[PDB]
Amino acid sequence: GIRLSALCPKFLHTNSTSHTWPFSAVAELIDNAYDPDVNAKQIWIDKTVISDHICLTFTDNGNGMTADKLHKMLSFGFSDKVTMNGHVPVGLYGNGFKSGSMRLGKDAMVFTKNGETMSVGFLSQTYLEVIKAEHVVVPIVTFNKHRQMINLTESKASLAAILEHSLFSTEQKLLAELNAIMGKKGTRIIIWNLRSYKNATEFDFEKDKYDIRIPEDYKKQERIAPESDYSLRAYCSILYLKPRMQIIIRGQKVKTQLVSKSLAYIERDVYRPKFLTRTVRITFGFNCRNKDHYGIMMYHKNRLIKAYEKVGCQNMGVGVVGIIECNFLKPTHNKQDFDYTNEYRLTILALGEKLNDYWNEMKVKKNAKRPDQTWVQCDACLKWRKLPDGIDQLPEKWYCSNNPDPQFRNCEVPEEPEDE
């Protein structure tokens, strides 16, 4: 007769509150895709308009979810990720999708295909306010490979709601999105009702059509700004120490930085704390190029948590960059920092000493193009339609009807000027 704790639609907002820099939310999304359970090799992040609503889409060629798995994805605290073949999941907390989506927008939807079934899931605050739900209820609809609805009681109710309050009015509209995942397997997440201050979405899409950006009016709270603070592309480059996945933003793929070609006078150092059985490597180099952005780069489970943390000499030391990965440390709610523990503290302390050593030893020597866009021609328009990078192969011929890009899915849609 014991009760269960309950979830209030209001909570959905609350959970967002730890993300004070939007890219943190996005990064959460990318991670879910990168993770070995999903194991996608490409993720496409895009801005589009649907139904008069600006949208953000995250689409990946990955394993996708069973309908049940989707429920958990829309539930709080469930995570079962495990390392595979040395691919270590970032996921731990079972919370990242909810905080991120919601940080990003009021309403979201998930389309997933696992190659046996395909399902659609709904998380909207807007929806919930409207029906005045006292509980967070997540509608889900599932289909057979033959697009036959297969869990009817849930599915019919889910569908009615989705269709009514969703961005997509008719099944056809849903199935289009489902079909934007070209592979047999994969997932597409659409977020709409994006945060806006004044009358404009929080992000700036105008400044660069090939980036998602934060408007100048930009530096993060902590500290002249590295690009990663304000450019999603720049950020994405340094996101993973050893990439396993391709991130494509705005249809242009992202070029991962390599330490070689990025740093000079490189040297290796080690950390051998008392509290750890294993050694931890560190890499130190001076910064070529901008040489206003230096610090430790802290990576956890191969992902970047903090950048340009200044250690030792906060002036006295500059242009020095250190790269380290600390699996022992524990990330914060937004994964932009570690829990502030003695161990974290010891580590910071050590890095500065280690770095300090580096400066002095080296210190002496130093003192002495975008890729082309791709289009496909429709065979029933003869019109040319833009294509995102990262597609290995296509069907024998291509029609505007099967355009993943929502905006050019009609043959009747004027062709897009190529770049001037």
């Binding site: 660069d208 890729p371 791709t374 289009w375 496909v376 021609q377 294509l387 291509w398 190529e418 001037e420």
Partner: peptide, 10 residues
Amino acid sequence: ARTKQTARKS
């Protein structure tokens, strides 16, 4: 299908 390549300029 038919794919053409064009330059992207900042």
